[PDB]
Amino acid sequence: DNQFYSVEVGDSTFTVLKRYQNLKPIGSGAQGIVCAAYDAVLDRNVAIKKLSRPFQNQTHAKRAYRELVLMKCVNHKNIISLLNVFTPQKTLEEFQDVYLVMELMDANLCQVIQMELDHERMSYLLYQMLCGIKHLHSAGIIHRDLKPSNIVVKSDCTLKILDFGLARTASFMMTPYVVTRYYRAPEVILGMGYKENVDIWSVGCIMGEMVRHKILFPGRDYIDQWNKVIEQLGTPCPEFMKKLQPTVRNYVENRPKYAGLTFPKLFPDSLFPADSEHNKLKASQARDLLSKMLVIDPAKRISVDDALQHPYINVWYDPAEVEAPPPQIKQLDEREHTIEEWKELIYKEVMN
Ligand SMILES: CCCCCCn1c(=S)[nH]c2c1c(=O)[nH]c(=O)n2C
């Protein structure tokens, strides 16, 4: 009668509490493998993520720890919530793996992106991304890495963000897995200091992908990515370069120039539901919002608050969803530690 049992998924051994049944692999993420399971105590399905030796390096260890603390203390319909945490190992020395148990949704945004959504749905998804982001922002968490693979949806269009983004500071990782850059803001690509609206860029990139069914700026590296950006939106006016460091500013002011394209050209009428008057008016509103989110210079880019006040989005506005009490966060939450120290930190958190 041990409280745990073991089953194979690919080359993984999941060792989980006996309550969780019928493990099925649904994903091979970044820090871990993810499984769907039935939880016999709660009487519902759930997602279970195995973190392997998350203390292996500092990037894994910071993400895991940040994940743990933030997920324990954020409670919001639009950020995935933690049902349960555990390790099968019994002491600090045998300690190896962390399992997070979370509510199970039906799909991620990547699958949604390959379908044609009506405006009521697309706008609802977007409204919900903005709510979740606003909530993070109100606890001083700026995400910096929204991407459709860390967003998930249910069949009834409810949506939740999976992760809490980048760690403020940051670095190297021995991996076969390459990290996705396509939704990262100009200020992050050019390392120039960011604010809250850094997450609006990512949103606009996702909305733009939703409409076009094609990653907007699919670069192999940050160089390529910046080219794909200026090709379309055009070279940022002088005022924005003035804000860059002369070292990178040099590089930027030295690319081929682009007048760059107009929003009707970037996102043509054909891409939108536009047969009834409702839909023509919505399309117009959709394109208006994109043109304010996909703005290179964050001084000119729309904010989360304004984008929630936007016509396309405003319809769903609920002050319960939008002005929810901020999470209370641990303080040094951009800290440096040896691997032995990270193991301690994480273990203590898994055990409370
Ligand atoms: C048979 C249902 C497939 C739904 C997959 C959605 N999904 C993905 S993908 N990853 C996660 C989820 C999820 O719902 N909850 C989570 O905690 N994570 C990590």
UniProtKB/Swiss-Prot annotation:
Q: How does it sit in the membrane?
A: Lipid-anchor
Its required cofactor(s), as named, are:
Mg(2+)
Q: Where this protein primarily resides, as one coarse class?
A: cytoplasm
Protein kinase domain location, by residue?
20-313
Its Gene Ontology biological processes? cellular senescence; Fc-epsilon receptor signaling pathway; JNK cascade; protein phosphorylation; regulation of circadian rhythm; response to light stimulus; rhythmic process; signal transduction
From the Swiss-Prot or TrEMBL record, state where the protein is found.
Cytoplasm; Membrane; Nucleus; Mitochondrion
MF (Gene Ontology): ATP binding; JUN kinase activity; MAP kinase kinase activity; protein serine kinase activity
So which domain of life are we looking at? Eukaryota
Q: What regulates the activity here?
A: Activated by threonine and tyrosine phosphorylation by two dual specificity kinases, MAP2K4 and MAP2K7. MAP2K7 phosphorylates MAPK10 on Thr-175 causing a conformational change and a large increase in Vmax. MAP2K4 then phosphorylates Tyr-177 resulting in a further increase in Vmax. Inhibited by dual specificity phosphatases, such as DUSP1. Inhibited by HDAC9.
Q: Which family does it belong to?
A: Belongs to the protein kinase superfamily. CMGC Ser/Thr protein kinase family. MAP kinase subfamily.
| Record text about domains | The TXY motif contains the threonine and tyrosine residues whose phosphorylation activates the MAP kinases.
The name this protein carries in UniProt is Mitogen-activated protein kinase 10
Source species of the chain: Homo sapiens
The organism's taxonomic lineage, starting at the top: Eukaryota, Metazoa, Chordata, Craniata, Vertebrata
- Encoding gene per record: MAPK10
Where the shown chain sits in the full protein? 45 to 400 of 464
